[PDB]
């Protein structure tokens, strides 16, 4: 419930979760609010840590300011970032092809403290791209989405490795801070502790210790147990504090004698001077929590400390001693163990706010370098910060991040589901991350800290398995970028409701219960030995007093898309992966019927995807239309909601909306008011409910093809709408300027039956393949004339035709009406590339029926192409005369283990025909766990089984027993779920009963007409002479070396020689072949291919006397 | 002595001179293999050998000017050294010392990198090449066909067999010339199926 205009969808769920689903886009909106410094972010961070409420922009400016001379006599100070409102609204910005933006203001102050002379301005900083209500940016009119990234956090990382020979646990410390140097404290086969800082040699630890002010007596005094370290202190053979420092400097710096000031300053620069080393707030928190240095002190002084270094050394040496825990001096005890980099307490999530902050930092450093070098060249006490500031590198950095970066992906919107799940995506590659060749096999696996923080089912199935993954449902991102997860805090076997978010480290600390544990209706458990996850990913049995955390619900481990598959717990993970992957490739239909059986999480995933218009304040509808709704509020004010009628999506599908209310209703704040592309009454809907049957049918469904009735084509059950955009433009050439006219070279008035007075076609003119859309003719200049052409022109008496036609024509197999013609002109004060005068764009919108060659899929990944659309009459039918609509195959179910489709089909028939459990002698035995008001239901009523707590098989059989008859006394489907099918072609009944029922199948956007292309002879490459490739142009197919091997092994020499000489390379022989074909003569003998002549000329060019030999 | 005697006996059996290591006249690759193309819009593209050739031309002309002028040996031998380095950078850029780069600091692709590696004329044009008279589509089951048969969609086969159908429907006088045949095939008039 809790959404007021919801359809009544009964559920099978036995449990009752306490916590509703979060807002599914707070992985994006909260991050960008943190970057901006929103009021809502300000109050939320006030109630969660108000010691340092500071936005990211304020933080970068506080890091940068002040900027001063080398003499320190003047100062430049940055403060107070500020945003005004936007410059243009959303849809207008989308249509007029610019970027959604807002102006940026700071308070930059310059002081000359030679006598003290401040100058303060309010410097305009630039136009800043901003995020809409949904969570996307709009860049250059199109729509873009920034995908979050997984990097490993800076901090300490101990481990151990074994030796093949010495069998020694090589405990190695690594600190990998952000923008700093590296250092390690390593133990080799010898009893020696290196300090081999930044790819250097294993000096003794006492060398660094005496450099920092710890002589050998202090070392043995602090460490009375480190016998290995005092073995090094005898092995070190170098004593003295400054002697150690100069030894460090002369090992660090070749080419320079050891000078004390450089020895001091390079160590200070690499350790405490924050410029060339600064681990961030996250890394500082990581170290302060790992070694327990501070207690409740927040993040400040983000450089190193000798206390941290000596605590690190102590931790390493006690770990190699074999200590399990140790109190640091002045700090609490901590467990002592190794670290794994795949553990999810050590892979933070750099979201959109962090990425943009890094971009602005790397722009602002390049700006302030110019500022610091230019203040010297400017005069003294005669300049202003307006003269100082150059915001060009900042705005250039922003635009070169939004373009030209694989983390600013193109927005992928086939439907609301894919639009939602393109956000909440965690990548693993990119800049600052590892490439796919560097992706070792222990990063694509499923570490058992993923439970609740990343779904293990959903991933792209190509060469990207496990690199790209989605968020879980209930997850939430820390202020530092770690991934939290709710848990009920059960106290002493009584389950409370104080829901406590935890991270991976606390989850490793404590003991976690299981979601469906039998609580005794007040808090108490029932069985004493309950299931438990442990620290090491163990599954145990514990008495019910060490349990302190129970799960909030089941299905916490699963994604958004994979929480929509019904009966997921009966399916294998391969087919579940394919089902959740192809749930993001549906198409928006024209009727969009809601599914008969789904999970309850379909309403939330639609009203949170943002592609459904939602009323904001409760009120009464005043006037509806097809395009605008005027909701009248309670107090006077009114508000109109414009629609988007047939706008093109990013992949070529329509995005129509339509209202679903009347002129007198009362709506509440949050009620769905208008369906979107793939919605029906608010909830998601990607396909239709089609009657199915699972027998094999006469070979037309072999190796999982699919046959269909003709009723789908006739009733427009599966009929998408596609919208294609074609674009042409008029530049300026060397030989003049191109133009757009009705008049062309010598093509008749038949082709000018539709073109308007100034070029382009009229709106609504139905086109065919290859027709003229824009009439443009180019000045080709004048060339010389052949005498034969001169004679023919003298004979016929025509215009010289000194211009060449380049008209935009519709490519092959495209047709349908014309919606809109958008025209931009350089004369019309619009943004154009230089030389281009007029830019035009035509939208062609074919309505595409279902056809053979298209791809259909169920929800559990049982895809398949469409074999043969039979006519309606010779398609098998039940005893009532109803023909079935799609016949699957039965050899594809048992060998793939996805019987979720069979259970879904049985429940589909039960939910269609409706049931009533006969409670004459009370409730029957299977219906004990069944709720009230699932005992009976009307025909064509919907149900919902959730994912991991669904309907049991006993409940399915019990529902199938009682399935009230259609119109007469007729139970068409008996107790087994099967039915008695006649045969429409022959006429006799099938001898054995056959499973029927109501499946739910979608239509996939890999239609045939996108894919089919051929090429007889078309364009060609320039530097080489192979034909072009791609289906936008003609394109020819690549003939790989495996196919060369196939032809050689067959023995057809002539076909291979023909395919490698005259169809691809021999430019003087291709036209001879073409004319021999056209005239009708024999095909001539092939010549020498051009690749061989290229190779021959190269070998002659490299001073190699290459010669051929005849005899 | 054996390791030298390999190449020594090779030169012994050869009638070839051992003078091939020195060089007096670098050959020039023909200009179509290093195209001076331009785009629609005044943008000009070369293939990076022209820079190396231009460099060798400049060094050679300067050395000829200095040797007719008469100069001290420091100047003359420094010029000889940079000429020799330029020729080496032309033949194999990146072997000795450092590769010569340009804009964006990519090293210039020399002559040998048109054969070396996976982008030369021994692999990258000898794996495979795209062909004409091709096409591809998705496949469905044809369970009434005989074994040697296969289906074909007409909008593909018409494109595939286009010159054959041009010749045949000129020979049946449905279009008196080849351009008329091509326009008839493009407009897909209904006679082309019975010809096809």
């Amino acid at each position: 419930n809790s959404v007021p205009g919801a359809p009544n969808r009964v559920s099978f769920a036995k449990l009752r979760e306490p916590l509703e689903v979060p807002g599914l886009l707070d992985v994006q909106t909260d991050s960008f609010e943190w970057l901006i410094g929103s009021p809502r972010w300000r109050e939320s961070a006030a109630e969660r840590g108000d010691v340092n409420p500071v936005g990211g922009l304020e933080e970068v400016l506080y890091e940068l300011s002040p900027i001063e001379d080398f003499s320190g006599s003047m100062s430049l100070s940055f403060s107070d970032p500020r945003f005004d409102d936007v410059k243009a609204p959303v849809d207008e910005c989308k249509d007029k092809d610019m970027t959604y933006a807002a102006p940026l203001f700071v308070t930059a102050e310059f002081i000359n403290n030679n006598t003290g002379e401040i100058k303060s301005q309010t410097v305009f900083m630039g136009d800043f791209p901003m995020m809409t209500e949904k969570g996307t940016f709009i860049i250059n009119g199109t729509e873009r989405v920034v995908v979050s990234q997984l990097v490993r956090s800076p901090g300490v990382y101990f481990d151990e490795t074994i030796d093949k020979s010495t069998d020694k646990t090589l405990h190695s410390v690594k600190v990998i801070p952000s923008r700093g140097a590296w250092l390690e404290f390593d133990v080799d086969k010898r009893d020696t502790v290196g300090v081999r800082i930044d790819r250097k040699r294993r000096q003794p630890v006492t060398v660094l210790l005496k450099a920092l002010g710890w002589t050998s007596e202090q070392i043995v005094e602090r460490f009375g147990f480190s016998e290995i370290m005092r073995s090094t202190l005898e092995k070190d053979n170098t004593v003295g504090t400054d002697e150690a420092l100069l030894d460090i400097y002369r090992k660090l710096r070749p080419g320079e004698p050891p000078t004390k000031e450089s020895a001091q300053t390079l160590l200070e620069n690499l350790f405490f001077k924050e410029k060339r080393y600064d681990l961030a707030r996250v890394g500082r928190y990581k170290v302060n929590k790992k070694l327990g240095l501070h207690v409740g002190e927040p993040i400040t002084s983000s450089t190193l400390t000798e206390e941290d270094v000596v605590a690190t050394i102590e931790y390493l040496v006690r770990l190699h001693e074999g200590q399990t825990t140790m109190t640091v001096p002045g700090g609490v005890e901590v467990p002592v163990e190794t670290d794994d980099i795949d553990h999810f307490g050590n892979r933070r999530l750099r979201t959109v706010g962090e990425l943009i902050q890094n971009q602005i930092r790397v722009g602002m450093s390049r700006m302030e370098r110019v500022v610091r070098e230019r203040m010297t060249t400017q005069d003294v006490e005669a300049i202003t910060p307006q003269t100082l500031i150059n915001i060009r590198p900042v705005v250039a950095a922003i635009k070169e991040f939004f373009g030209t970066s694989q983390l600013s992906q193109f927005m992928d919107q086939n439907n609301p589901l894919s639009g939602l799940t393109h956000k909440r995506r965690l990548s693993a590659l990119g800049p600052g991350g590892l490439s796919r060749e560097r992706a070792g096999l222990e990063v694509r696996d499923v570490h058992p800290s993923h439970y609740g923080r990343m779904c293990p089912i959903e991933t792209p199935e190509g060469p990207n398995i496990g690199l790209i993954g989605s968020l879980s449902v209930y997850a939430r991102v820390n202020p530092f970028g770690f991934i939290e997860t709710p848990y009920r805090k059960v106290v002493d076997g009584v389950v409370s409701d104080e829901i406590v978010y935890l991270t991976a480290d606390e989850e490793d600390r404590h003991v976690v219960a299981q979601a469906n544990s039998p609580i005794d209706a007040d808090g108490r458990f029932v069985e004493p030995r309950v299931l438990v996850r442990r620290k090491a990913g163990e599954v145990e049995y514990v008495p019910s007093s060490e349990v302190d955390y129970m799960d909030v619900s089941p299905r916490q481990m699963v994604s958004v898309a994979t929480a929509m598959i019904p009966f997921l717990e009966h399916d294998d993970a391969n087919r579940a992966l394919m089902g959740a992957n192809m749930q993001r490739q549906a198409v928006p239909l024209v009727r969009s019927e809601a599914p008969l059986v789904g999970t309850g999480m379909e309403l939330r995933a639609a009203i949170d995807a943002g592609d459904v218009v939602v009323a904001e304040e409760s009120g009464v509808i005043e006037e509806v239309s097809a395009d605008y709704i005027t909701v009248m509020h309670d107090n006077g004010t009114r508000r109109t909601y414009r629609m988007r009628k047939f706008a093109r999506s990013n992949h070529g599908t329509c995005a129509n909306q339509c209202p679903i209310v009347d002129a007198g209703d009362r709506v509440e704040a949050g009620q769905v008011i208008a369906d979107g592309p793939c919605t029906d009454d608010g909830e998601m809907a990607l396909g239709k409910n089609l009657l199915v049957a699972i027998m094999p049918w006469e070979g037309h469904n072999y190796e999982d093809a699919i046959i269909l009735s003709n009723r789908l084509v006739e009733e427009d059950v599966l009929t998408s709408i596609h919208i294609e955009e074609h674009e042409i433009d008029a530049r300026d050439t060397k030989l003049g300027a191109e133009e757009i006219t009705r008049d062309i070279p010598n093509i008749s008035d038949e082709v000018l039956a539709d073109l308007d007075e100034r070029g382009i076609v009229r709106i609504g003119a139905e086109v065919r393949d290859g027709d003229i859309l824009v009439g443009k003719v180019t000045p080709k200049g004048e060339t010389e004339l052949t005498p034969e052409e001169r004679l023919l022109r003298a004979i016929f008496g025509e215009k010289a035709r000194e211009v060449r036609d380049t008209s935009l024509k519709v490519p092959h197999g495209e047709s349908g009406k014309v919606i809109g013609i958008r025209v931009f002109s350089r004369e019309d004060e619009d943004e154009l590339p230089a030389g281009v005068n007029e830019l035009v764009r035509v939208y062609v919108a074919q309505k595409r029926k279902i056809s053979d060659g298209d791809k259909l899929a169920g929800r559990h990944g049982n895809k398949g192409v469409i074999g043969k659309i039979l006519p309606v009459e010779d398609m098998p039918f039940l005893a009532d005369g109803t023909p079935v609509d799609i016949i699957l195959n039965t050899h594809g179910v048992p060998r793939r283990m996805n019987i979720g489709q069979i259970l879904e089909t049985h429940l589909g028939w039960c939910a269609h025909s409706g049931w009533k459990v006969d409670a004459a002698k009370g409730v029957p035995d299977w219906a004990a766990r069944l709720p009230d008001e699932l005992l009976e239901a009307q025909p064509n009523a919907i149900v919902s089984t959730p994912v991991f707590d669904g309907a049991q098989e006993a409940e399915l059989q019990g529902l199938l027993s009682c399935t009230l008859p259609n119109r007469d006394g007729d139970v068409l489907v008996d107790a087994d779920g099967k039915a008695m099918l006649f045969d429409g072609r022959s006429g006799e009944p099938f001898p054995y009963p056959v499973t029927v029922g109501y499946m739910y199948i979608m239509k996939l956007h890999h239609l045939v007409d996108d894919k089919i292309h051929a090429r007889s002879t078309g364009p060609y490459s320039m530097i080489t002479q192979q034909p072009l490739g791609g289906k936008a142009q003609f394109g020819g197919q690549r003939f790989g070396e495996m196919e060369c091997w196939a032809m050689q092994a067959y023995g057809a020499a002539y076909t291979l020689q023909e395919l490698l000489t005259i169809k691809s390379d021999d430019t003087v022989g291709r036209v001879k072949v073409y004319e021999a074909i056209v005239k009708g003569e024999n095909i001539p003998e092939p010549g020498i291919p051009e690749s061989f002549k290229v190779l021959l000329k190269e070998l002659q060019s490299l001073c190699l006397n290459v010669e051929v030999l005849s005899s | 002595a054996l390791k030298r005697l390999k190449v020594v006996a090779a030169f012994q059996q050869s009638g070839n001179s051992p003078m091939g290591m020195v060089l007096d006249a670098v050959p020039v690759i023909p200009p179509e293999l290093r195209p001076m193309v331009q785009l629609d819009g005044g943008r000009f593209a070369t293939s990076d050998l022209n820079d190396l050739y231009r460099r060798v031309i400049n060094r050679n002309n300067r050395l000829k000017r200095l040797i007719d002028l008469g100069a001290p040996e420091i100047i003359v031998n420094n010029e000889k050294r940079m000429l020799q380095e330029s020729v080496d950078a032309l033949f194999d850029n990146g072997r000795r010392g450092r590769p010569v780069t340009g804009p964006g600091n990519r090293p210039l692709k020399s002559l040998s990198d048109l054969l070396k590696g996976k982008q030369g004329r021994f692999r990258q044009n000898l794996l495979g090449k795209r062909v004409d008279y091709s096409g591809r589509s998705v496949i469905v089951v044809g369970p009434q066909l005989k074994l040697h048969q296969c289906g074909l969609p007409k909008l593909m086969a018409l494109e595939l067999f286009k010159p054959f159908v041009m010749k045949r429907l000129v020979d049946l006088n449905h279009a008196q010339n080849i351009k008329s045949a091509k326009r008839m095939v493009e407009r897909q008039r209904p006679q082309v199926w019975d010809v096809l």
Partner: peptide
């Protein structure tokens, strides 16, 4: 004092050759 030989041996021959261009 465990690993210096190979790194120093490679480094000296690397720094000898590359500093003698023209």
């Amino acid at each position: 004092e465990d690993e210096s030989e190979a790194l120093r041996q490679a480094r000296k021959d690397a720094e000898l050759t590359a500093s003698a261009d023209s």
